[PDB]
Amino acid sequence: MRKFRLIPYKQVDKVSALSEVPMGVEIVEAPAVWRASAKGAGQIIGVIDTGCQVDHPDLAERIIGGVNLTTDYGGDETNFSDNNGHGTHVAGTVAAAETGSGVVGVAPKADLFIIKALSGDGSGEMGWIAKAIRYAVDWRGPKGEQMRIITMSLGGPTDSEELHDAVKYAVSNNVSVVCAAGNNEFAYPAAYNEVIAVGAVDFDLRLSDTEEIDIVAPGVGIKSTYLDSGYAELSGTAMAAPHVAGALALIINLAEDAFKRSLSETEIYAQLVRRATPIGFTAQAEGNGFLTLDLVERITGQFT
Amino acid sequence: MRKFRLIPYKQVDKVSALSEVPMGVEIVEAPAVWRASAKGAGQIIGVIDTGCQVDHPDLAERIIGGVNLTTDYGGDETNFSDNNGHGTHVAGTVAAAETGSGVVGVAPKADLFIIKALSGDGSGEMGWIAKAIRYAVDWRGPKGEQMRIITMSLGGPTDSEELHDAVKYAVSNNVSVVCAAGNNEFAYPAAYNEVIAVGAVDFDLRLSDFTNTNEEIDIVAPGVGIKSTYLDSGYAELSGTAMAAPHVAGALALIINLAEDAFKRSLSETEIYAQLVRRATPIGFTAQAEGNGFLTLDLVERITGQFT
Ligand code: NA
Ligand code: NA
Structure with missing residues (x-):
């Protein structure tokens, strides 16, 4: 293997x-x-x-x-x-x-x-x-x-200026950079402050498992597309990130329609964070919480 | 008065x-x-x-x-x-x-x-x-x-490189720059994308003509009949769009502490901004009028563990 690679995961099942x-x-x-x-x-x-x-x-x-x-x-x-x-x-x-x-x-x-x-x-x-x-x-x-969103489920152990500059270039050009935050050998690029680092939970919102995360999403027993026109169910830290990457597409449309202007990558990040519900662990463990796309609608008009 | 000035406000009362x-x-x-x-x-x-x-x-x-x-x-x-x-x-x-x-x-x-x-x-x-x-x-x-927070309640009509560069210098050096929205003689610096622009509601969470803005705002806070400190060891009650901004500047100090403790790590200006927006409750006004909502510092605690 080369140095940067897919964060490990498990194949639970394949179906056609x-x-x-x-x-x-x-x-x-x-x-x-x-x-x-x-x-x-x-x-x-x-x-x-x-x-x-x-x-x-x-x-x-x-x-x-x-x-x-x-x-x-x-x-x-x-x-x-x-x-x-x-x-x-x-x-x-x-x-x-x-x-x-x-x-x-x-x-x-x-x-x-x-x-x-x-x-x-x-x-x-x-x-x-x-x-x-x-x-x-x-x-x-x-x-x-x-493109305003890029997503990765990979990491390498080395901090290099070339890779960190690339990430800086993306966010300075208003591109959200999503990477799975998983298990040291897979630290980079997820460890870079600019990156939206995603952790995983199961469908009962239990943590899958020092990672500096922004949000959690589903990572256990995730069915999706696979080779030869069929499907596979995978489980791993990296299964979470793709949910956030799709969510960002929805949120940029939601937010820019609401605000009636183009929003910076900072503002888009805030709008993602806005739509995370803490599970009840600490923010060190779950970041801002679990991706909950309809949260803003539920809190609207809800006062002490 | 010069070009850059305090955003207009009313003094309602002045007590000792x-x-x-x-x-x-x-x-x-x-x-x-x-x-x-x-x-x-x-x-x-x-x-x-x-x-x-x-x-x-x-x-x-x-x-x-x-x-x-x-x-x-x-x-x-x-x-x-x-x-x-x-x-x-x-x-x-x-x-x-x-x-x-x-x-x-x-x-x-x-x-x-x-x-x-x-x-x-x-x-x-x-x-x-x-x-x-x-x-x-x-x-x-x-x-x-x-300092990680600055606050201003002022505006002027002119965009210039010098002023915008200063704002960018702050934000790139992780300083949150809070600005009252002007009630556009008062457009800058609140119109700079980098600044947290704050509008006003009253205590019924309603808008008022004197405190309304056309600025692009991020959040609203109380701005009508705000009692505070004043000259000669006394107090004054002010109303005005600019009354709201200081509530947000103080709130950021609270936020930085509670969120860096929660995350167990130092957070950037970007992240602190999100921490602020995530503590705004929409009131039901348009996003033009209220930004992301009204400042409600305990919101994250209120939503914790609440799933549909
Ligand atoms: Na399909
Ligand atoms: Na006192």
Whole structure:
């Protein structure tokens, strides 16, 4: 393996068929805000991972492009197909489409831009990760479309100026950088102050497990898309982050519609924090709490 | 008056003696978080205003230093006494001490650093306001103390590089910059994206024409009939959009303490901002009118463990 790699996880199950809104999407309250958020239409998430099955039935209509920054496929930059499975799983939790079967993501009208920066074994060079971040920031679509969210479920032990500068470049250019905060060897980039660091809980809101986190989301028994047009149930710290990345698409639409202006990445971060409900551990352990997308509606007009 | 000046306000009453917790301190829920935040101990707020009555009895024990950046007192930099009143009133809302009498502020163990950047008439040169911001950022106490919060209740019509650079310098050096919204003669610095812009409601959480704003605001706090400290060891009741900002400046001292304890680590200006927004309860006005809501410091405790 190369130095930066996927935070370890467990495969619970693989199935060729599903038809449900996964419970993770349901208990972070995504369906409650879908109408007001237009399901994340108009936002694009750069998924920095192992690639994606581009013609997966739940995902094909949501992918707007991609790039391969790894040596895989002889270094062909137009081939971001998934030779691991993990990047396909991430993509589904973010933005699997409503198709009448399979699964549905947190933001089922957001667009995905697939950045394969990990090789088939789930590892990559620090420089690949730094370049993936800068690429995401700098990319422009045909009509000047850009990404405002990037998500990673990876870490490496080394603090390098190249990688930290990339993260600074992203947030200074109003891109939210989501990384899973997991188990030292996986410290960076999640440890950087600029990053929205996500921890995991199970569906009973118990912590999965010094990490400096901002928020928790579902990470146990998470069903999503996988290779060969089928599905897999994974459990790990890194299963949480993709929920937050889809949530950000919904929240930027919610907040900018409310405020009637463009909001900075600082302000978007506050709007995410706004929508976290403490479970009742300490903030050192759960950050701001559990992602609860409809919280603002519930507190409105509620006075002492 | 000069170009940059205090945002207009009314003096409703002026008394010699008072004994209460002003309602604004109450309704923002500051007492509910005092224990957890050690009443703002260890935090210093830079009050950029007309000076302060440095021996006021509600204030003298809270004040740790000052500077005068104006031409008042023939430019004596060590004379930051208040020749207007408004600075004293602000200082009181932020951090008036617990005494058995008088008033008490939102953060009654927070320290004040008094920066006189406005003249007796409540106006100042943009340059003085720029310098005041940088001054607060660069200042270090006898043991290396720093300010992490500055507050202003002023505005002027002109955007300039100098003033915006000062604001950015603060925020990039983790200093929260709080600004009252103007009631656009009073557009800057409150219109800078980097600043926390605060609007006003009254004690029924209602809007009023005199306190309304067209500024892009982040939060609202009480601004109508706010009793605080004033000249000659007395008290005054002021109404005005700018009455709200000091409630937020004090609140930040409480927030920084309680959130850095909760997280068990130092938090950036960005993170402190989120900590503030997460303690705003929407009242039902538009986001233009109220930003993220009304300052309710105990909100995080109220929502804890509450899932649908
Ligand atoms: Na589907
Ligand atoms: Na007192």
